Amino acid sequence: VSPPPPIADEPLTVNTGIYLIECYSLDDKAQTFKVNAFLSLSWKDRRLAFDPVRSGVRVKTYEPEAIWIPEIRFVNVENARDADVVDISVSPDGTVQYLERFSARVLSPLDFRRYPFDSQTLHIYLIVRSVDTRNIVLAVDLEKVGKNDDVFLTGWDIESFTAVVKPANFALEDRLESKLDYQLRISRQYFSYIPNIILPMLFILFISWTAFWSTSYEANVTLVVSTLIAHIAFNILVETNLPKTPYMTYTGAIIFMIYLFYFVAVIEVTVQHYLKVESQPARAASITRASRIAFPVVFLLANIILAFLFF
Amino acid sequence: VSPPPPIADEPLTVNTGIYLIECYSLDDKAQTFKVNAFLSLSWKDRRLAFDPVRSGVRVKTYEPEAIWIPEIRFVNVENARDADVVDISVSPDGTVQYLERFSARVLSPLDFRRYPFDSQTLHIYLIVRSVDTRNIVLAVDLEKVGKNDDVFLTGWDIESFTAVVKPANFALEDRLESKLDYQLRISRQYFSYIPNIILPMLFILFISWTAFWSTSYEANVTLVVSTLIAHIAFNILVETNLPKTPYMTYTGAIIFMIYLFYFVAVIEVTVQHYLKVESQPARAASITRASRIAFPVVFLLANIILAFLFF
Amino acid sequence: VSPPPPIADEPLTVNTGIYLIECYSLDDKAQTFKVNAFLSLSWKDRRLAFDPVRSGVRVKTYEPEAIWIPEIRFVNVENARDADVVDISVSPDGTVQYLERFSARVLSPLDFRRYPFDSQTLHIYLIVRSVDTRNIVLAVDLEKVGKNDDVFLTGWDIESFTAVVKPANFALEDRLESKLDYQLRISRQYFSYIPNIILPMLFILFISWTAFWSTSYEANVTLVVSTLIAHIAFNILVETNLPKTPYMTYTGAIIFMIYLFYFVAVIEVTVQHYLKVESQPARAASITRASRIAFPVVFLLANIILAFLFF
Amino acid sequence: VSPPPPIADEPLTVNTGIYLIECYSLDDKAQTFKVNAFLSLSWKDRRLAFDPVRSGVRVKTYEPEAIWIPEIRFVNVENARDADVVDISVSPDGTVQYLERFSARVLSPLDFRRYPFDSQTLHIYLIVRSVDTRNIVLAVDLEKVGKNDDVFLTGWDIESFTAVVKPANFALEDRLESKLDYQLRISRQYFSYIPNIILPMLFILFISWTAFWSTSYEANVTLVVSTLIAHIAFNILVETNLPKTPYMTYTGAIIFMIYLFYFVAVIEVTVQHYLKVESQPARAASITRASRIAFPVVFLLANIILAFLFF
Amino acid sequence: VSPPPPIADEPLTVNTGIYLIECYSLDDKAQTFKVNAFLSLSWKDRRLAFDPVRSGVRVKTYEPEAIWIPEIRFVNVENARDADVVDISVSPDGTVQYLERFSARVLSPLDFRRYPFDSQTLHIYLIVRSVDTRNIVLAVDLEKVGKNDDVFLTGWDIESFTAVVKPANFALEDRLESKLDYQLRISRQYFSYIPNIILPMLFILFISWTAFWSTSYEANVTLVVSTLIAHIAFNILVETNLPKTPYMTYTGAIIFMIYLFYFVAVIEVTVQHYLKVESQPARAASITRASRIAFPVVFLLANIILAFLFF
Ligand SMILES: [Cl-]
Ligand SMILES: [Cl-]
Ligand SMILES: [Cl-]
Ligand SMILES: [Cl-]
Ligand SMILES: [Cl-]
Ligand SMILES: [Cl-]
Ligand SMILES: [Cl-]
Ligand code: NA
Ligand code: NA
Ligand code: NA
Ligand code: NA
Ligand code: NA
Ligand code: NA
């Protein structure tokens, strides 16, 4: 079968729609998400047109093999989508109404700069390649774009599912391609990160600062070195949940900065002990008393600077 | 083939049933479970009706391609179910009896608030989309709903498998959809959590409290800091078994609260040492003696408050 | 095609056989195992009967589509088996001899009570559903039941592969079902658990007991707390290899009991230090000397009690 | 269908092109990467030639089954590619223009010597096997070789996608094989390794060197042994991200060398304590003062030697 | 189609060949490896014989459906191979030349006794089952057996790919089976194990022996107990890379033996301290001085004994 013939030099408009049924498996490391949705397609085929009086029927149901169907693909997928045709209905003016239910693993990059207080715009790119007989252009039927109420994405708040109505028409290998952009706006549920990573990480840091109220070098060494090892464990835990980024993330910046605080606390603990052994505890006492104020003040100000730079 | 014609304007009733054969792979993190079951369908097709006297046969067996079969799908699945038709039997009045055996990965959200003393209602949503000729409505044949005795779900007690008999009839993309809710009620086998997570976590906390019977700062620092690191290991272990929730879980609340007890024990150990060095051991002794009662009493009361808020 | 017609009211006997070729991927956590085997089927179809003199041939080879073949399924599988027909041979009396090679992931629950000194009976349930024309019953052809010599299951000793010759005939959705039970008896190769988990776990426990020959509280605290952390690591390691059970396993009981020994050792170390500080080292010496005998004796007796209860 | 007949003894030239759409899942351990691209093929088939005046059409569109298409395969794949034909267009002279969209998991070895400051040349080998009637040779149509702008590879900078225009023609099982080499040049985004592995690893090493400003053996033992354990954690973390190589990687060399620095620091800490106990602290003081300069100087020089040998 | 008829009572010889293209994913734990290769088959079918003068053609190309092809399978696979026919060529005498390209996950057990200095013989078992008309025997065409030069197996040195030319002819379910053994000889690249596991494990052990040059019980306890915990981490790391074996591996023996050295070092450290407290440091000094020689000498000799028993 060949595509429908053009009245004038006009291209063939294929009206599209995506209705999300299930949304799942958003892999932060892979930058992928899995989708289960309806894909609706509509175009006019004058060759399929019929008399309602003469034929008796108001609409004709065809099997995919019986009629011409546009080769519609997704750009940003891993493998060709798993699809199952639900219905094909032809009106007697030749207006075809196609509906399929599909599942695909969509590849969409994420911006981790503000992690875990980040928001994302996931994309689903629909595409059609023009044939030699005719040029095919995609359009959005807004009445056929949406999502089910029950659609949930573990660890995410689904904000909106909309389509950029104007297609990106371009040439690829000397043929017109009509590309449509479907956008799923999400925002991370940061809640769990507070009692599981942030608050624990702060507690161990504050425990290391108790060395500023101790003259016992052996105890101070144990306090600062032990809490530093727990901080290393939290750093490893965080980086296993995230992919390697060519930029600094918000959590990554805080985690990295806290290492500098542990390093300076080791210097303070060392300086204090050296002075005490040198019979200079009065100078050591001045440094330790200053450290009690300096460490929390510099930590608070550095975090204000970080929060300002990132948000 | 077209759907059966309506006598009057009445919709076509498709009676359904699900009989669970195997239940497995309940993934807490993914909020998914795998199912292997029978799906029974029954509807009247007057065009298939025959006289038992004339034809000779009491029932006619057809192949799926030979007759009209309703396009029945699951709402909350990852991918279309893997199905294999078992039987299609037509009675003289045109009553069709369809049976298939399928397997599917069902996406059903879980409520982890009371974890690991939680109960869940897993859902399997059956759905049919109306055609242009006729409107299709789903119904439950209660005699065809059930489960095999051998059906087990590792780490769970299967309570019941029932169906909400009245369908959710609604419009989706200007067509009637008839949705049925099948509910599998389960309750977690909490047993293993007691000797593997809860009891060990309490033992290490109680070991940290031995510092209240010691004047040795170096030993106290080792006791409280070492047990805190073991607590961090249990926290990481627990959160690997669970997905990130925008709410606090029961275990998560206990785990988080225990950090505050470690933090205050570090303060006590620090205060006691500072006072001893300041030649004030009488004041330090009063604080340590109070701590011996305060810590277990505040721990017991805070746990009563938590258990009350969660159950 | 319809099933063979009954001479008298007798059911149609389908003789079965399973010959294991490959056995692999026994997942303890999932309670699944993967199998690759031959499935042989034999039944009489009088409609296929022929004269060897007239036809010339001793046996007739048919393609699956050409003749009636019983819809044979496995009960306890994840998905329908991956099968490939090898041969279909018909004898002059109409006796059909079918052979296929299949692969399936079989779901069979395991009893971990005696782990890792446990034995299991894996099951493969063959099933046939009766048709409206005739009732179909399964039988075992013992000459066609067996396994290849090279059949190995990593970490397991394959003991026997037999079939319960009498089928479980029952009604499911108003139709007769004939179920056969194939049993693969296995026993775990416990060897590796001795140098990798048991012996190391005992060594660290015995190291904690050296604190009974030390008066140094700081060293004792280090000894008992450090070895307890290594015991936590072994507990976490063991529970990653096992699923969560609503009962106590043998290894789980030993692991749990050892926590009580660490807890009492901390109490002893604390009591000894408190008494020494109170200027009562004579009383402390009596407790420490008793502990040197009490700890290994109570450990040995408790293990005899455990081994008796579990075996 | 048979291949096109040769005018003279000349082989049949199949012009090829690969246009990358999506690039993903570069597994360092497996030495694999996943690709989604267009594969364009062009060859002359004089039997398909037609007159544009007589036929009316400028180009003829065929289905794959209708005409002869060369059996084109990838050498370095896991499984045969997942392909879907997009278009087949024949020009009046018989010039066939084939286009398919495919996805494949490509097996290409990586050189980890300079890791994580490494660059790679990923290969995609196209191959055709000659038939008995004719010899088939591959060619590159440079106008049909390229990549989409949006093509990203998490943790990598895509440099170029080019083809080695001259094929590797050879004999395999007494038949000519024409192999083409498509090269994707990439360079690793090392950024993240600096705040996550390298800087932390240096901090813990520098903390171990504070023992050179302490006379307390107990504190020194804690400092050097604790930091060594954190170094073991970083070594284990690094080797989980990398496959086992029969050569030394840059990071592997630095990680290994740092063990020698910890080992010598333990010797220094031991020697210092032995001398102090032997009433020789003046000799011990000379060794510790030298160590304060020797350790950072030898570390800096050894790293210059390593960086020189590796880059 | 039926198999070729026998001139005399001779069986039908199917000449075989395997040419490896890609070798990958050797899973030590699963005892599996993935292969991508050519499978060549050749047999004489007198019914397909033709005159080159009369027909005009020197060779006839057939589609698999058109002619009889032997049902060739692999014994030690997980699932049936993924195959794609490349060519089928018939010579005038009826000699058929079949070629397919396949991919399969091969199940072949490994001997870990000498790990990681082990060598393996991977097996690929080809098999044919005789039909009722004729007996089918397999043969090796040595000119069609080989491997590509680029064939690499991450962490392994590919030594040779040969075939045992004489088949194992046997009876399975009253039918002849002709089995061929293809052997891929590999040897592990042990290099990486030296700087990543062996050298680090020795360093921590040697650090524990510094306690023999210290009279400080508290420091000795820290040294021996801390290094023992790092040894536990290396033991856990090693056993995650290996499957559970009913025998002792070389690395497993060394790892286990080192526990005994840590245990005896704890006894030495305990005995030394007990004697010092008992005012017997002269006896303690004799034991510690002996230990300085005994520990490295017994370690070196025990390793010579182990290396002798294993190689
Ligand atoms: Cl697609
Ligand atoms: Cl479905
Ligand atoms: Cl099945
Ligand atoms: Cl391919
Ligand atoms: Cl050549
Ligand atoms: Cl050739
Ligand atoms: Cl196979
Ligand atoms: Na079509
Ligand atoms: Na139908
Ligand atoms: Na059939
Ligand atoms: Na310590
Ligand atoms: Na073709
Ligand atoms: Na065939």
Author numbering:
A (entry chain B), B (entry chain C), C (entry chain D), D (entry chain A), E (entry chain E): 5 to 315
From the article:
At present, the best structurally characterized pLGIC is the G. violaceus ligand-gated ion channel (GLIC), of prokaryotic origin. Each subunit consists of an extracellular domain (ECD), predominantly in a β-sandwich fold, and a transmembrane domain (TMD) composed of four helices, labeled M1–M4. However, the GLIC is a pH-gated channel, activated by lowering the pH, with a maximal activation at pH 4 and a pH50 around 5. We instead found that proton activation is a complex multiple loci mechanism, with the key contribution stemming from the coupling interface between the extracellular and transmembrane domain, with E35 acting as a key proton-sensing residue.
